[PDB]
Amino acid sequence: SRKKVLLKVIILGDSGVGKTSLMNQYVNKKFSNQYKATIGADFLTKEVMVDDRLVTMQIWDTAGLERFQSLGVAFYRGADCCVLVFDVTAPNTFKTLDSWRDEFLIQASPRDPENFPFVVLGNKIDLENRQVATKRAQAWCYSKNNIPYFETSAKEAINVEQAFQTIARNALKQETEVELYNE
Amino acid sequence: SRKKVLLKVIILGDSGVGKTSLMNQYVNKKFSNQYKATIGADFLTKEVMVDDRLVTMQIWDTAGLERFQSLGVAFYRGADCCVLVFDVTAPNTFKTLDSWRDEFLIQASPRDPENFPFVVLGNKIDLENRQVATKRAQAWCYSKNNIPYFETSAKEAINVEQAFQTIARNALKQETEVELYNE
Amino acid sequence: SREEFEQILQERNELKAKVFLLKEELAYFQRELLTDHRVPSLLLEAMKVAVRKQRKKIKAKMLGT
Amino acid sequence: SREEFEQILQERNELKAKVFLLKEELAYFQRELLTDHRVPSLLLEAMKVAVRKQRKKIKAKMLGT
Numbered sequence: 191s192r193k194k195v196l197l198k199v200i201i202l203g204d205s206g207v208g209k210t211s212l213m214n215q216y217v218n219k220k221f222s223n224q225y226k227a228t229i230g231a232d233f234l235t236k237e238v239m240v241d242d243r244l245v246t247m248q249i250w251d252t253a254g255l256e257r258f259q260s261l262g263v264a265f266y267r268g269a270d271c272c273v274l275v276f277d278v279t280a281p282n283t284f285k286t287l288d289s290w291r292d293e294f295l296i297q298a299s300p301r302d303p304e305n306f307p308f309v310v311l312g313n314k315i316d317l318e319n320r321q322v323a324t325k326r327a328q329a330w331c332y333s334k335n336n337i338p339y340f341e342t343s344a345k346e347a348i349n350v351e352q353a354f355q356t357i358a359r360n361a362l363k364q365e366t367e368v369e370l371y372n373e
Numbered sequence: 374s375r376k377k378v379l380l381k382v383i384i385l386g387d388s389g390v391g392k393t394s395l396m397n398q399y400v401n402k403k404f405s406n407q408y409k410a411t412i413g414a415d416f417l418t419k420e421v422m423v424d425d426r427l428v429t430m431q432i433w434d435t436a437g438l439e440r441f442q443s444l445g446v447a448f449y450r451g452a453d454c455c456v457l458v459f460d461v462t463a464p465n466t467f468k469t470l471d472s473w474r475d476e477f478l479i480q481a482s483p484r485d486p487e488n489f490p491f492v493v494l495g496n497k498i499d500l501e502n503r504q505v506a507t508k509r510a511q512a513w514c515y516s517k518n519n520i521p522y523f524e525t526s527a528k529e530a531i532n533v534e535q536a537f538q539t540i541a542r543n544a545l546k547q548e549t550e551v552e553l554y555n556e
Numbered sequence: 557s558r559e560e561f562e563q564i565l566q567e568r569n570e571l572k573a574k575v576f577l578l579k580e581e582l583a584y585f586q587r588e589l590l591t592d593h594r595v596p597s598l599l600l601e602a603m604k605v606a607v608r609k610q611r612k613k614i615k616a617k618m619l620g621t
Numbered sequence: 622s623r624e625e626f627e628q629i630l631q632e633r634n635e636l637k638a639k640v641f642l643l644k645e646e647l648a649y650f651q652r653e654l655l656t657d658h659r660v661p662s663l664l665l666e667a668m669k670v671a672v673r674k675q676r677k678k679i680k681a682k683m684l685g686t
């Protein structure tokens with residue numbers, strides 16, 4: 191039918207922030223209050239339209255809990271984009287953002303590091319409590335290499351579809367995407 | 374091309390006897406002195422000719438170590454044949470044969486239990502030491518419902534090909550095999 | 557705690573990946589089937605409904621469902 | 622020791638199984654391709670050598686090899 195390609199997204203962030211919940215919300219439009227610590231690293235795939243192009247996104251969910259961050263087995267190499275996710279109500283998860291983005295670059299080590307797609311999701315905004323300010327997070331994202339930032343709510347699906355849309359477009363606008371099966 | 378089907382073999386037996394080694398020997402014609410306790414349960418597939426029929430054998434290797442015999446998750450249901458394996462130099466592994474064959478029936482629970490294919494492999498005969506006598510093991514197999522017995526040596530590949538040949542024929546002569554993809 | 561943990565997992569990934577790709581190759585060939593390499597429509601669909609049908613069967617006895 | 626162990630494993634099996642079946646379905650279709658549903662020989666082979674070729678590529682970046 192039409193041309194197809196694949197992108198590889200690596201979602202990172204401290205244990206708790208909502209990475210697993212953000213991914214499920216996007217991929218299966220489902221959520222659950224019942225937590226379930228993610229160990230190791232796993233992934234999903236979803237296909238959506240991206241300007242007459244049919245892109246299949248390989249979304250990797252990772253472990254935020256240090257005592258499970260086992261493998262790390264360069265399953266990062268593909269990564270056409272990296273999603274830095276934190277808990278808006280939990281300030282530390284925002285503090286350590288540099289830990290992750292850095293860590294990513296060191297592992298992945300993508301050509302043209304100063305332009306690699308990064309999307310920052312400020313999760314759980316659906317809670318009254320809130321220790322990190324949008325402006326703050328904003329001031330930070332731009333401050334990097336003007337990477338987009340989205341306040342999200344894996345729970346009430348705020349900007350989940352929207353976040354991944356941009357996640358899809360920046361990774362794609364980087365020419366790194368792999369073709370699929372089109373003889 | 375030709376018609377195809379699949380058989381499911383469940384290899385059982387105490388930890389040590391050589392189940393993993395027997396399977397590898399048969400499937401990849403490989404062996405290793407370096408042991409490596411099998412946990413849970415895994416399987417392989419091999420295709421060989423069985424009288425103008427092309428049979429793919431799904432061989433399941435199991436854990437002999439009780440503290441790993443986790444799942445047992447009725448991955449036995451298919452089982453068109455069960456291979457009871459023991460360590461000829463290790464008498465206990467022969468003593469507990471009833472434990473396994475029984476256990477199998479209880480789990481699998483196949484129609485016509487009094488005729489379900491069973492193959493008993495007396496492994497490691499390539500060691501001078503030997504506590505179980507062929508006749509003894511023989512006397513026992515027949516004593517059940519005259520099931521075949523093969524003295525084997527996963528190490529020097531004695532009767533490995535031969536064992537699985539019979540394993541293939543008795544499971545097949547039981548009509549339980551599943552067809553494959555032949556429109 | 558199982559030290560070999562980085563094994564089943566690492567394989568779980570590999571296989572999950574394969575299963576994705578094989579899925580491609582199929583629909584690929586399945587399409588390349590009704591290309592100018594032509595052959596009935598609705599049928600090629602039943603073929604699918606045939607395999608997917610047989611699949612359930614075999615797979616089931618494979619995992620002991 | 623991981624209590625969820627009966628998870629990755631149980632999936633490892635399921636996926637291993639799928640990968641076996643999909644392998645069938647392919648060679649099936651791949652054959653059903655050059656059936657009376659006819660189409661070149663040696664080529665249909667290159668197609669394979671083509672996919673298997675592309676496969677390596679994509680799969681690789683999928684697992685970060």
Ligand SMILES: Nc1nc2c(ncn2[C@@H]2O[C@H](COP(=O)(O)OP(=O)(O)OP(=O)(O)O)[C@@H](O)[C@H]2O)c(=O)[nH]1
Nearest residue numbers: 205206208209210211223225228254314343344345
């Ligand atoms: N109110 C609210 N709760 C959320 C939101 N996103 C996630 N949660 C909850 O917070 C927890 C985070 O869950 P996961 O996505 O499973 O895990 P993670 O902590 O982000 O990542 P790992 O610990 O490494 O698995 C869960 O108990 C979710 O129910 C959100 O937007 N709003």
Ligand SMILES: Nc1nc2c(ncn2[C@@H]2O[C@H](COP(=O)(O)OP(=O)(O)OP(=O)(O)O)[C@@H](O)[C@H]2O)c(=O)[nH]1
Nearest residue numbers: 388389391392393394406408411437497526527528
């Ligand atoms: N000499 C000799 N050694 C063997 C033979 N078969 C297996 N062994 C060795 O005995 C051990 C048995 O190994 P495995 O097949 O891995 O395991 P298993 O004990 O049979 O089953 P699990 O413990 O449940 O994994 C290994 O260290 C092998 O090298 C044989 O025929 N001859």
Ligand SMILES: [Mg+2]
Nearest residue numbers: 209210228252
């Ligand atoms: Mg997670």
Ligand SMILES: [Mg+2]
Nearest residue numbers: 392393411435
């Ligand atoms: Mg074993």
